[PDB]
């Protein structure tokens, strides 16, 4: 959308932030222009250490003078890498923690009807959670990395062009010759990466369907050919993944083969300009190296321009809610204040529409009147919009044409502290702020005393139930310290809206929690607060209103009738049908925020986003998403268990380990020839310097064709090895998912969109966990080892000093690689308690705006941001000092080697070019060694969070389908029998729909288990085939128990028909041959013409060929049912399990099942469950299920003959249409 500029993100800066962005900007220029000064000092040293080969006294002076200048360069990097980290990390905190304090004052002042849950308060909660971390990521510390590497580029061309300007043009005109050779590798590599994502989307829908339709995959035993369809379309991503490793051996080979043919260009012309007497050997080290790493340092300044554009995009959305001027405000000057209110609210000609969609007209010419000290009611029977009455006296909205008078004063002339202080609100599922149960009661009145809270808890039936909790009124209600998690809370607005002592008391439909003896206690609690208070009762169920003096009924825009309930029950005028309607009778936001973070977890770093959940009913839970360090849960043998699964490819790793050792020989051979030409440039013979610099160019060319054949063996192999491992894991993951129980799929984190990504992104990061961490270990250990064998043969006295110095060299470079990603570290974990307070004063804003609790949520937010700021003062002074002190042990420790090496030469032990070769080889080696020890924790710490998918492989199923020591199934005649069985779902095990259940079905009969308003009837057909096991008892079929049989050999003669049918992504020839494997063309036509749809399917373009499941022709609900019955008649089952529930016929003039119900019963055993009192005339028997038992049994000639029973009440529900 729109965007701010990059400036005005700094608009929350005070005069102490203009002082930290000034010191930390001078400190980043001086830190930047110091690597092109190391190349000016190490160049001028060699001109004194190497021109003085015949004067062994000048050598000691002109090295001890320049080895003091590395301690002075060490101090300037010490106190200027401290100033670009401690100033840009702490001044990026103080500016974004003053954006949080003003964005939250803005979202406490907007109108309360702005938040109507339709992904409006799912962006406000998301903008305070993530858009504030993107502003901080932009402006804090990636601004100092911009100035650091931009000033090196500017100062690599001023050191480079003053020493020798003809070699600072040759070593700059090579840089377009390399970045173009490497910008064609990274173009074609994305083009094969994009085709691999497209090739998996064909096989990405087979796992998508067979997890979503898992009731049909198990019922028709076809969980073996859901693999053979999957394991034939994975094989088109494997072969496309082979030639994305050959585009990487040819991309790193032909980049290190041009860069090694470009030192040969610029070390030749450096060796011509010396022979003409224009440069020397230290003005050609300065000119070449300061103009290459100066030019290369633009690839790091422009790496930070991605975060600067996400920062401008996110920071607009914040800066447009801050200055959005609202409508309903408080006027401290244009406001009144009455005295002795009475509570006479009269909606006198009030019309109103919802400003989200102005189409309907809720209150066209609405009129009611509220007396003082009385109890009125507002009740409808449908969507009258009656709960808008309590949402309008609050002034959450405005009547767009009308007026509302409080004791004869229009309420648009009243300030919102004389109004909301007089109105107490009790609502649906009331907001419990995660504090004590003493501070929640003190929102109705902020500070009076202690004994009035006990008085207010006494007249609410609450004084007893919070002393039988083992803490003295101090109980954290958010997290389960003591579990007062009952459905009967003290509905603590009943305790709040008495302590406040309101004059007008607006109740609501505060009985929606499966009313029982517990909800009868709060009913007689509400009947003692309604004394002398002009209360309304928005009521949905009429049972709670039956003893009230005056009741008013509204139906469409206006009141219809008023008066007592002795004349309201009279005349039958639009109330007698409503009591007939009484006789015939959050978790969304945590899912919405995860999908909104869906789409962008593809990239944001893991230290910057969240993972959202509900937790308990205290708040919305926000785990920092850097939960991988805390997790540390892989099996302890996991690196050995992935090498056993990837060991039929042993010839593709014995041939790949002789391609990764040969690549370690190019490191030191670069640094032996380059340190042999520093010696050559100081000859005094100008023809033995010519024919010895030809033969160091021919090695640079021959090692630019050795680096093409040795990166092609390392990368083509080890990608044949790692792509037969992602393919083998994917076939082992889906074959283990389709073995579990059905209740495992019913859980909240096992829907077929979070579990089909574990086969796509969690099985594709096993390639980069056991194949790309042996390539860079065999390479980096054969270069560490071959440069400590050379260095002890050239000279062993200096190279023993570099062994003791070697921890001080690999630690200075370990810190120079953490600095490229930043030292702040997991900034989404400190700002997590702050957001859970900001994220509960948005979704509970109906209860924050009432009670005038808007200056208390801002106090709990500003008194708590002091913890993430003192965490960042202690970190930025410590991390900026340990980084600035490890750099003094890099330059101060190369001053010791070059002094002790220039000590032995004056005593005649060593020579020149025995000290330089040892110095150049062992320092370039130390950069690679501090990369093996940077991927060292991930090898130990459980791989990572996505290499820890053994939870689908190492998981034990509850219901085991295939057993060898189980009795097989040959012929089931049908002897359905239940003994004493009780059963509950594992999703909510408190509900106990079965309680000692009993049935008995003989062979060759039917069963017609009745509706009873959905009294847990849709679980008998979920136990004839083992979708669920019973908790206690047996299920007897054919005289044998059901937990003794081969389950795959049983379900091929028990075939159901689903509630709402579903169709796979194939033609209508495999969607009706899915339940007979085998059938070809004779009994496919015959099984069509039973519930026919045959002239329906004869009219079709490609015969019987069209995709009908998805991405094809869209059929109707009356035609999908005629497909699914063609399945269940080709299979020829013996125990037919029909199904109807929840009014899903979806067809007028029903005939698609009427042909089925009379034809398909004629030789089978059927179990028909339906909620309607029709079509269930199974002429053999019919039982009535109530409360987990049967109450009456007998067919439709002895079940209607009895006078009442329980079936005749459902016979009265026939004519209630």
From Swiss-Prot:
Similarity remark: Belongs to the ABC transporter superfamily. ABCB family. Multidrug resistance exporter (TC 3.A.1.201) subfamily.
Source organism phylogeny: Eukaryota, Viridiplantae, Streptophyta, Embryophyta, Tracheophyta
Renumbered residue ranges of the record's region Interaction with FKBP42/TWD1: 931-1217
Location(s), subcellular: Cell membrane
InterPro entries cross-referenced by the UniProt entry: AAA+_ATPase, ABC1_TM_dom, ABC1_TM_sf, ABC_transporter-like_ATP-bd, ABC_transporter-like_CS, P-loop_NTPase, Type_1_exporter
Name of the protein this chain belongs to: ABC transporter B family member 19
Subunit structure as annotated in this protein's UniProt entry: Interacts with 1-naphthylphthalamic acid (NPA), and FKBP42/TWD1.
Gene Ontology CC terms, in alphabetical order: cytosol; plasma membrane
């Amino acid at each position: 959308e729109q965007s701010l500029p990059f400036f005005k993100l700094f608009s929350f800066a005070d005069k102490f932030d203009y002082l930290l962005m000034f010191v930390g900007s001078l400190g980043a220029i001086v830190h930047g222009s110091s690597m092109p000064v190391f190349f000016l000092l190490f160049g001028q040293m060699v001109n004194g250490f190497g021109k003085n080969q015949m004067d062994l006294h000048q050598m000691v002076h002109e090295v001890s003078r320049y080895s003091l200048y590395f301690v002075y360069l060490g101090l300037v990097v010490c106190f200027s890498s401290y100033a670009e980290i401690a100033c840009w990390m702490y001044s990026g905190e103080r500016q974004v923690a003053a954006l949080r304090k003003k964005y939250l004052e803005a979202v406490l002042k907007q109108d309360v009807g702005f938040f109507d849950t339709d992904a409006r308060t799912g962006d406000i909660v998301f903008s305070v959670s993530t858009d504030t971390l993107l502003v901080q990521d932009a402006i804090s510390e990636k601004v100092g990395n911009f100035i650091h590497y931009l000033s090196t580029f500017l100062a690599g061309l001023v050191v480079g062009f003053v020493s020798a300007w003809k070699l600072a043009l040759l070593s700059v005109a090579v840089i377009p010759g390399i970045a173009f050779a490497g910008g064609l590798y990274a173009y074609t590599l994305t083009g094969i990466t994009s085709k691999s994502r497209e090739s998996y989307a064909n096989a990405g829908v087979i796992a998508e369907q067979a997890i979503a339709q898992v009731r049909t995959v198990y019922s028709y035993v076809g969980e073996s050919k859901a693999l053979n369809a999957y394991s034939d379309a994975i094989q088109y991503t494997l072969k496309l993944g082979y030639k994305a490793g050959m585009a990487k051996g040819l991309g790193l080979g032909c980049t290190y083969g041009i860069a090694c043919m470009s030192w040969a260009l610029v070390f030749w012309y450096a060796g011509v300009f010396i022979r003409n007497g224009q440069t020397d050997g230290g003005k050609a080290f300065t000119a070449i190296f300061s103009a290459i790493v100066g030019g290369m340092s633009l690839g790091q300044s422009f790496s930070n321009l991605g975060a600067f554009s996400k920062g401008k995009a996110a920071g607009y959305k914040l800066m447009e809610i801050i200055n959005q001027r609202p409508t309903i405000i408080q006027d401290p000057l244009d406001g009144k204040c009455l005295d002795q209110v009475h509570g006479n609210i009269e909606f006198k000609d009030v019309t109103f529409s919802y400003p989200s969609r102005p189409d309907v007209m809720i209150f066209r010419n609405f009129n009611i009147f509220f007396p003082s000290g009385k109890t009125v009611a507002v009740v409808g029977g449908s969507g009258s919009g009656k709960s808008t009455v309590v949402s309008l006296i609050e002034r959450f909205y405005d009547p767009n044409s009308g007026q509302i008078l409080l004791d004869g004063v229009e309420i648009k002339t009243l300030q919102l502290k004389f109004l909301r202080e007089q109105i107490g609100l009790v609502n649906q599922e009331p907001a419990l702020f995660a504090t004590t149960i003493l501070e929640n009661i003190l929102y109705g009145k902020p500070d009076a005393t202690m004994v009035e809270v006990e008085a207010a808890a006494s007249a609410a039936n609450a004084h007893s139930f919070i002393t039988l909790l083992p803490k003295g009124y101090d109980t954290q209600v958010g997290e389960r310290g003591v579990q007062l998690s009952g459905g009967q809370k003290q509905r603590i607005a009943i305790a709040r809206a008495m302590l406040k002592d309101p004059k007008i008391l607006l109740l609501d439909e505060a009985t929606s929690a499966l009313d029982a003896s517990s909800e009868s206690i709060v009913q007689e609690a509400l009947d003692r607060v309604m004394v002398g208070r002009t209360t309304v009762v928005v009521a949905h169920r009429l049972c709670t209103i039956r003893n009230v003096d005056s009741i008013a009924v509204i139906q469409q825009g206006q009141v219809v009738e008023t008066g007592t309930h002795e004349e309201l029950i009279a005349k039958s005028g639009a109330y007698a049908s409503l009591i007939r309607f009484q006789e015939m009778v959050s978790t969304r936001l945590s899912h919405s925020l995860s999908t909104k973070s869906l789409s962008l977890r593809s990239g944001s770093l893991r230290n910057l986003s969240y993972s959202y959940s509900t937790g308990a009913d205290g708040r919305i839970e926000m785990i920092s998403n850097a939960e991988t360090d805390r997790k540390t849960r892989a099996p302890e043998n996991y690196f050995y268990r992935l090498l056993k699964l990837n060991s039929p490819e042993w010839p593709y790793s014995i041939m790949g380990a002789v391609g990764s050792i040969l690549s370690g020989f190019i490191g030191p051979t670069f640094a032996i020839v380059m340190s042999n030409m520093i010696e050559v440039f100081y000859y005094t013979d100008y023809d033995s310097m010519e024919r010895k610099t030809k033969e160091y160019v021919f090695i640079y060319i021959g090692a630019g064709l050795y680096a093409v054949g040795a990166y092609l063996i390392q990368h083509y192999f080890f990608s044949i090895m790692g792509e037969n491992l992602t393919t083998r894991v994917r076939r082992m993951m889906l074959s283990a998912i389709l073995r579990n129980e059905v209740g495992w799929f019913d859980e909240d984190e096992h829907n077929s969109s979070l579990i089909a990504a574990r086969l796509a992104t969690d099985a594709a990061d096993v390639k980069s966990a056991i194949a790309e961490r042996i390539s860079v270990i065999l390479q980096n250990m054969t270069s560490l080892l071959t440069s400590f064998i050379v260095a002890f043969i050239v000279e062993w006295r200096v190279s023993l000093l570099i062994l003791g110095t070697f921890p001080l060299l690999v630690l200075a470079n370990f810190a120079q690689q953490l600095s490229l990603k930043g030292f702040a570290g997991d900034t989404a974990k400190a700002h997590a308690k702050t957001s859970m307070i900001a994220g509960e004063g948005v979704s509970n804003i109906r209860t924050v705006a009432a009670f005038n609790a808007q200056s208390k949520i801002l106090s709990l937010f500003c008194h708590e941001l002091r913890v993430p700021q003192k965490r960042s003062l202690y970190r930025s002074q410590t991390s900026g000092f340990l980084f600035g002190l490890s750099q003094l042990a890099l330059y101060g420790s190369e001053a010791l080697i070059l002094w002790y090496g220039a000590h032995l030469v004056s005593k005649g032990v060593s020579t020149f070019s025995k000290v330089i070769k040892v110095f150049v080889v062992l320092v370039i080696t130390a950069n690679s060694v501090a990369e093996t020890v940077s991927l060292a924790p991930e090898i130990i710490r459980g791989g990572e969070a996505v290499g820890s998918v053994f939870s689908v492989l190492d998981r034990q199923t509850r219901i085991d389908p295939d057993d060898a020591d189980a009795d097989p199934v040959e012929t089931i005649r049908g002897d359905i029998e239940f003994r004493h069985v009780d059963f509950a779902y594992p999703s909510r095990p408190d509900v106990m729909v079965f309680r000692d259940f009993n049935l008995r079905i003989r062979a060759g009969h039917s069963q017609a288990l009745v509706g009873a308003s959905g009294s847990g009837k849709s679980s008998v057909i979920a136990m004839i085939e083992r979708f669920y096991d019973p908790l206690a008892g047996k299920v007897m079929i054919d005289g044998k128990d059901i937990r003794r049989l081969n389950l795959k050999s049983l379900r091929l003669k028990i075939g159901l028909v689903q509630q709402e049918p579903a169709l796979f992504a194939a033609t209508i020839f495999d969607n009706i041959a899915y339940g007979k494997d085998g059938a070809t063309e004779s009994e496919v036509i015959d099984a069509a013409r039973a519930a026919n749809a045959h002239g329906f399917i004869s009219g079709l373009p490609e015969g019987y060929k069209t995709p009908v499941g998805e991405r094809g022709v869209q059929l109707s609900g009356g035609q999908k049912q005629r497909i699914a019955i063609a399945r269940a008649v080709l299979k020829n089952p013996t125990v037919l399990l029909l199904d109807e529930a929840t009014s899903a016929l979806d067809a007028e003039s029903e005939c698609v099942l009427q042909e089925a119900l009379e034809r398909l019963m004629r030789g089978r055993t059927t179990v028909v469950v339906a909620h309607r009192l029709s079509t269930i005339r199974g002429v053999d028997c019919i039982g009535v299920i109530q409360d987990g038992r049967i109450v009456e049994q007998g067919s439709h000639s002895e079940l209607v003959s009895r006078p009442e029973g329980a079936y005749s009440r459902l016979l009265q529900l026939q004519t209630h249409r």
